């Protein structure tokens, strides 16, 4: 409910988001989610629901112009040793970031995590979230439509996902969402 | 009365639900703020904004 109340901020001349331009409404929300996440670090709950809700709310505040658009927090919560609900919430935030900020290195981070993660459910979920919220569609001109990305995703369909039968269908779905049924256009 | 009259007297009791809710709420908020600032200062810390 605190995350639902966040309206987009009135940035002037692309002013860098600092404490000087912090909304007086959003400072209370940010204090509350900081208190909740830190208290979850000492007293946890069930399903780490409050970690998932606070990561989702920090991504809501980053989607508007309130918190700086930095994926390092979600990249630290998406490590292997965390609970799987925290991991998929953080990876959902990283997928949303690499869709909005057109990040090349975050997409390479996600594709590397698809290739070598210990939990195969997390790999399937990353392919699923990158299909649902794709970094670009076939209609879009994006900076991320190289021949290098076409070769990486074709290598991920062909080899690489050969051991799961669910990662390979997810890679086929991702290649269909990104490049369509015909020849990838952004290619010689 | 002062020559021989004695009655005990007590302190003013605050039985008001409004101020008791306010006291318990503010004490819980202050102790959780003090706890989280102490734990963020004596460990690894993050900061949404720069130098925060």
From Swiss-Prot, chain A:
Known tissue expression: Expressed in all tissues tested.
The record's subcellular location field reads: Nucleus
Q: Which family does it belong to?
A: Belongs to the TAF2 family.
Subunit description: Component of the TFIID basal transcription factor complex, composed of TATA-box-binding protein TBP, and a number of TBP-associated factors (TAFs), including TAF1, TAF2, TAF3, TAF4, TAF5, TAF6, TAF7, TAF8, TAF9, TAF10, TAF11, TAF12 and TAF13. Interacts with TAF2C1. Component of the TFTC-HAT complex.
Report further notes: PubMed:9418870 was unable to show an association between TAF2 and TFIID.
What does this chain do?
Answer: The TFIID basal transcription factor complex plays a major role in the initiation of RNA polymerase II (Pol II)-dependent transcription. TFIID recognizes and binds promoters with or without a TATA box via its subunit TBP, a TATA-box-binding protein, and promotes assembly of the pre-initiation complex (PIC). The TFIID complex consists of TBP and TBP-associated factors (TAFs), including TAF1, TAF2, TAF3, TAF4, TAF5, TAF6, TAF7, TAF8, TAF9, TAF10, TAF11, TAF12 and TAF13. TAF2 forms a promoter DNA binding subcomplex of TFIID, together with TAF7 and TAF1.
Q: Which disease is it linked to?
A: Neurodevelopmental disorder with feeding difficulties, thin corpus callosum, and foot deformity: An autosomal recessive disorder characterized by impaired intellectual development, microcephaly, delayed psychomotor development, pyramidal signs, thin corpus callosum, and foot deformity.
Name listed for the protein in its UniProt record: Transcription initiation factor TFIID subunit 2
Recorded source organism is: Homo sapiens (Human)
State the gene name recorded for this protein: TAF2
The stretch of the full-length protein covered here is 801 to 988 of 1199
UniProtKB/Swiss-Prot annotation, chain B:
Question: What's the encoding gene here?
Answer: TAF8
Say which domain of life the source belongs to: Eukaryota
Task: Report the induction information.
Answer: Induced with triglyceride accumulation.
Q: What does this protein do?
A: The TFIID basal transcription factor complex plays a major role in the initiation of RNA polymerase II (Pol II)-dependent transcription. TFIID recognizes and binds promoters with or without a TATA box via its subunit TBP, a TATA-box-binding protein, and promotes assembly of the pre-initiation complex (PIC). The TFIID complex consists of TBP and TBP-associated factors (TAFs), including TAF1, TAF2, TAF3, TAF4, TAF5, TAF6, TAF7, TAF8, TAF9, TAF10, TAF11, TAF12 and TAF13. The TFIID complex structure can be divided into 3 modules TFIID-A, TFIID-B, and TFIID-C.
Q: Which disease is it linked to?
A: Neurodevelopmental disorder with severe motor impairment, absent language, cerebral hypomyelination, and brain atrophy: An autosomal recessive disorder with onset soon after birth or in early infancy. Affected individuals do not show developmental progress, are unable to sit or walk, do not acquire speech, have poor visual fixation, and show poor overall growth associated with feeding problems. Additional variable features include seizures, spasticity, and joint contractures. Brain imaging shows hypomyelination, thin corpus callosum, and cerebral and cerebellar atrophy.
Record comment regarding domains: Ectopic expression of the histone fold domain acts as a dominant-negative mutant resulting in differentiation inhibition.
Q: What is this protein called?
A: Transcription initiation factor TFIID subunit 8
Species classification: Eukaryota, Metazoa, Chordata, Craniata, Vertebrata
Say which residues of the entire protein are included here: 156 to 207 of 310
Q: Where in the cell is it found?
A: Nucleus; Cytoplasm
Q: Which family does it belong to?
A: Belongs to the TAF8 family.
């Amino acid at each position: 409910a605190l995350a639902n109340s966040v309206t987009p901020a009135v940035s002037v001349n692309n002013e860098v988001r600092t404490l000087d331009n912090l909304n007086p409404d959003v400072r209370l929300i940010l204090e509350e989610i900081t208190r909740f996440l830190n208290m979850e670090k000492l007293l946890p709950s069930y399903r780490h629901t409050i970690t998932v809700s606070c990561l989702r709310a920090i991504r809501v505040l980053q989607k508007n112009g309130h918190v700086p658009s930095d994926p390092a927090l979600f990249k630290s919560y998406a490590e292997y040793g965390h609970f799987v609900d925290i991991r998929i919430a953080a990876l959902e935030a990283v997928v949303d970031y690499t869709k909005v900020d057109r990040s090349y290195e975050e997409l390479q981070w996600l594709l590397n995590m698809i290739q070598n993660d210990p939990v195969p459910y997390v790999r399937h979920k990353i392919l699923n979230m990158l299909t649902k919220n794709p970094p670009f569609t076939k209609n879009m001109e994006s900076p991320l439509c190289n021949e290098a990305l076409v070769d990486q995703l074709w290598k991920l369909m062909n080899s690489g996902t050969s051991h799961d039968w669910r990662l390979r269908c997810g890679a086929v779905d991702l290649y269909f969402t990104l490049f369509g049924l015909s020849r990838p256009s952004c290619l010689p | 009365p002062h020559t021989y009259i004695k009655t005990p007297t007590y302190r003013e009791p605050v039985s008001d639900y409004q101020v008791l809710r306010e006291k318990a709420a503010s004490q819980r908020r202050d102790v959780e703020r003090a706890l989280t600032r102490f734990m963020a200062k004596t460990g690894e810390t993050q900061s949404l904004f720069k130098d925060d």
